[PDB]
Design a protein around this ligand. Structure first.
Ligand SMILES: [Zn+2]
Length: 248
């Protein structure tokens, strides 16, 4: 069998490699410097998955995936988009979950950060910490975090992100959450999931912190983060100069 797994860096690459991807060439544009897809066929989970990859400035470990990803950013989107549907097993035309997609993508991404999550009671009687270097971390998107059971002394453990080094995507635990903007972890971008009315699934968009505008499909719309249920946040302290390695 032709050895495609080492080029692409994912299982069954040889199957994917031969597939026709043209069915996934969604119309795309550049809005505020980001590659975005026109809303169609319930593809908003794809749009916001790829937006957060861009906001995070992530790169993929393998030659094949990174070339696919770079093609996506420059507007040749079909192969990377097809791979997302292929990997997650989602049917074209059906709505899906961006957080689930991002969690699947994590193992393929070049590590770029470190997240410290503290589990502590309010008087400090019990305290523990873990350091996560996965590109995608599952934790509260709120500064105050989440309650996580009782300690032996009868207080609630509070589980919260206390340090982020580099860049990460924090995927909220629990349902999409609404709060005043300043109570969220401070991030460059916020994926939100809003009610879209009867008959249709909720709608995915990405709130852009620096402009205060919202990526909605391929348009830029006014938004209010204070009333938008957040599902994930890109937390990033960016580097000034991009560093690449010479090709061997
Ligand atoms: Zn305790």
């Amino acid at each position: 069998s032709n050895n495609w797994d080492s080029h692409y860096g994912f299982d069954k690459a040889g199957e994917f490699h031969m597939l026709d991807h043209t069915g996934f060439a969604f119309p795309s544009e550049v809005v505020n410097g980001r590659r975005v897809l026109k809303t169609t066929d319930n593809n908003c989970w794809v749009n916001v998955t790829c937006l957060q990859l861009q906001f995070a400035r992530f790169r993929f470990k393998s030659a094949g995936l990174q070339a696919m990803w770079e093609s996506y950013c420059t507007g040749d989107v079909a192969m990377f988009v097809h791979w997302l549907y292929w990997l997650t097993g989602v049917d074209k035309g059906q709505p899906s979950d961006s957080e689930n997609a991002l969690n699947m993508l994590s193992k393929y991404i070049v590590p770029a950060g470190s997240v410290t999550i503290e589990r502590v009671t309010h008087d400090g009687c019990c305290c523990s910490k873990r350091v996560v270097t996965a590109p995608v971390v599952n934790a509260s998107v709120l500064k105050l975090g989440v309650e996580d059971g009782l300690c032996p002394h009868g207080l609630n453990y509070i589980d919260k992100v206390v340090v982020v080094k580099g860049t990460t995507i924090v995927v909220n635990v629990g349902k999409p959450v609404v709060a005043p903007s300043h109570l969220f972890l401070k991030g460059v971008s916020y994926t939100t999931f809003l009610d879209n009315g009867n008959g249709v699934a909720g709608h995915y968009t990405v709130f852009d912190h620096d402009t205060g505008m919202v990526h909605d499909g391929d348009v830029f719309v006014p938004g209010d983060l204070n009333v938008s249920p957040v599902t994930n946040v890109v937390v990033s302290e960016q580097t000034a100069v991009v560093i690449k390695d010479p090709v061997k």
